[PDB]
Design an enzyme around this catalytic site. Structure first.
Site, PDB file in Angstrom:
ATOM      1  N   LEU A  53       0.754  -1.176  -0.011  1.00 38.81           N
ATOM      2  CA  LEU A  53       0.112   0.008   0.092  1.00 38.81           C
ATOM      3  C   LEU A  53       0.837   0.611  -0.112  1.00 38.81           C
ATOM      4  O   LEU A  53       1.643   0.690   0.201  1.00 38.81           O
ATOM      5  CB  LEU A  53      -1.010   0.302   0.983  1.00 38.81           C
ATOM      6  CG  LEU A  53      -2.187  -1.051   0.867  1.00 38.81           C
ATOM      7  CD1 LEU A  53      -2.838  -1.450   2.904  1.00 38.81           C
ATOM      8  CD2 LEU A  53      -3.250  -1.598  -0.317  1.00 38.81           C
ATOM      9  N   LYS A  63       6.292  -3.121  12.431  1.00 38.22           N
ATOM     10  CA  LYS A  63       6.194  -2.734  13.163  1.00 38.22           C
ATOM     11  C   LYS A  63       4.224  -3.264  12.912  1.00 38.22           C
ATOM     12  O   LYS A  63       4.019  -4.237  13.912  1.00 38.22           O
ATOM     13  CB  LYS A  63       5.386  -1.286  13.318  1.00 38.22           C
ATOM     14  CG  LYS A  63       6.418  -0.193  13.946  1.00 38.22           C
ATOM     15  CD  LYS A  63       6.338   0.886  13.640  1.00 38.22           C
ATOM     16  CE  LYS A  63       7.628   2.168  13.630  1.00 38.22           C
ATOM     17  NZ  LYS A  63       8.540   1.761  14.416  1.00 38.22           N
TER      18      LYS A  63
HETATM   19 NA    NA Z   1       3.813   0.991   0.324  1.00 33.59          NA
END
Ligand code: NA
Ligand SMILES: Nc1ccn([C@@H]2CS[C@H](COP(=O)(O)OP(=O)(O)OP(=O)(O)O)O2)c(=O)n1
Ligand SMILES: *P(=O)(O)OC[C@@H]1O[C@H](n2ccc(N)nc2=O)CS1
Ligand SMILES: [Cl-]
Ligand code: NA
Ligand code: NA
Ligand code: NA
Ligand code: NA
Ligand code: NA
Length: 292
Positions: A53, A63
């Site tokens: 994304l 994370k």
């Molecule tokens: Na990305």
DNA sequence: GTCGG
DNA sequence: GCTGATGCGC
DNA sequence: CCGACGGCGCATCAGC
């Protein structure tokens, strides 16, 4: 809501970057990652899936991986428990207390709302109002109340001078069921791209009828303050609400209206707020507020 | 922190 | 006291 | 690898 754990985590990190680290570009990076993940129609299973994304890079993927494994982030747990960092972050919830003021207060041992209350002399006007309505300001405004607020504003505006034009913009204009604040755009045929006391007179009337209760700022084109609907004999007081009023030149009025109605995303792909005799004229290249 | 020139 | 910088909200 | 990442009104500060 499929990835709320992750989006919550990223928003909390964003807040620490803005309020404690004073790293605005990292705040924005985390917020952008949070928002693209929020709209992602699958439940994320790995950091690698997220990275695909736009706005998710290597560190947020790492994370995400730690969060999926443990339901927590060591770094975030540690900053949460940090007395100094958590207090700074908290105080910025007060309107008028930004990262600089929060740091200064905490460094002086002023860490809680209680501490702020005991220290009125160290707060400026805005901060005193922010503290006074701390709880009220975090409440949203039901559509039903916004209509009643609209009623008062349009009535008093016409009362001062029937040639004013006023439009309550924001999500309210698009027909949303709640709003964070009331945004009023005001114009007058006398006020154009080259043109007395048009804003002050309206503000004064709204104060006269006890609708506006406090003032955060007021210049020649922009008022920011607090208002409240009247109650009655034995019905509980309405919360105090944030109200902005902007005076815009007549020939720029309808570009302002388009802008401040939004939505944010709609403005973005329709793409300034300044530069037309109606909303339709600009549409050029018509959609009503409901479908924006 | 992420992106892209 | 004047002017430009900075904090803040949005 | 390294700079961009937003603009603006108003209140108040900081430097003369
Ligand atoms: Na990305
Ligand atoms: N952060 C934002 C928000 C909105 N907009 C634009 C200009 S104002 C216009 C309408 O805003 P909305 O009222 O839908 O957004 P808000 O965040 O004020 O929702 P409320 O909580 O309903 O008040 O969208 C923007 O450029 N940047
Ligand atoms: P508020 O949250 O009521 O937003 C309404 C208008 O949107 C514009 N806006 C919002 C946020 C930020 N960061 N910048 C911005 O220009 C102006 S106020
Ligand atoms: Cl930054
Ligand atoms: Na920093
Ligand atoms: Na604040
Ligand atoms: Na805040
Ligand atoms: Na709003
Ligand atoms: Na101004």
């Amino acid at each position: 809501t499929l990835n709320g754990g992750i989006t919550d985590m990223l928003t909390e990190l964003a807040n620490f970057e803005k309020n404690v680290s004073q790293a605005i570009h990292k705040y924005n990076a985390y917020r952008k990652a949070a928002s693209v993940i929020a709209k992602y129609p699958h439940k994320i299973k790995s950091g690698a899936e997220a990275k695909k994304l736009p706005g998710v890079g290597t560190k947020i993927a790492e994370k995400i991986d730690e969060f999926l494994a443990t339901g927590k982030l060591r770094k975030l747990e540690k900053i949460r428990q940090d007395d100094t960092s958590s207090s700074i972050n908290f105080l910025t919830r007060v309107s008028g207390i930004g990262p600089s003021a929060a740091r200064k207060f905490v460094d002086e041992g002023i860490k809680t709302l209680e501490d702020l209350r005991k220290n009125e002399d160290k707060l400026n006007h805005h901060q005193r109002i922010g503290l006074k309505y701390f709880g009220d300001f975090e409440k949203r405004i039901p559509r039903e109340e916004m209509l009643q607020m609209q009623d008062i504003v349009l009535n008093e505006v016409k009362k001062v001078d029937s040639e004013y034009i006023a439009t309550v913009c924001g999500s309210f204009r698009r027909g949303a069921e709640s709003s964070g604040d009331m945004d009023v755009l005001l114009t007058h045929p006398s006020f154009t791209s080259e043109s007395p006391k048009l804003l002050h007179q309206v503000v004064e009337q709204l104060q006269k009828v006890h609708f506006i209760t406090d003032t955060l700022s007021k210049g020649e084109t922009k008022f920011m303050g607090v208002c409240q609907l009247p109650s009655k004999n034995d019905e509980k007081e309405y919360p105090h609400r944030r109200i902005d009023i902007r005076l815009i030149p007549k020939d720029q009025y309808y570009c302002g209206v388009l802008y401040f109605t939004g939505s944010d995303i709609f403005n973005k792909n329709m793409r300034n707020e300044y530069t037309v005799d109606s909303e339709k004229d600009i549409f050029d290249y018509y959609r009503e507020p409901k479908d924006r």
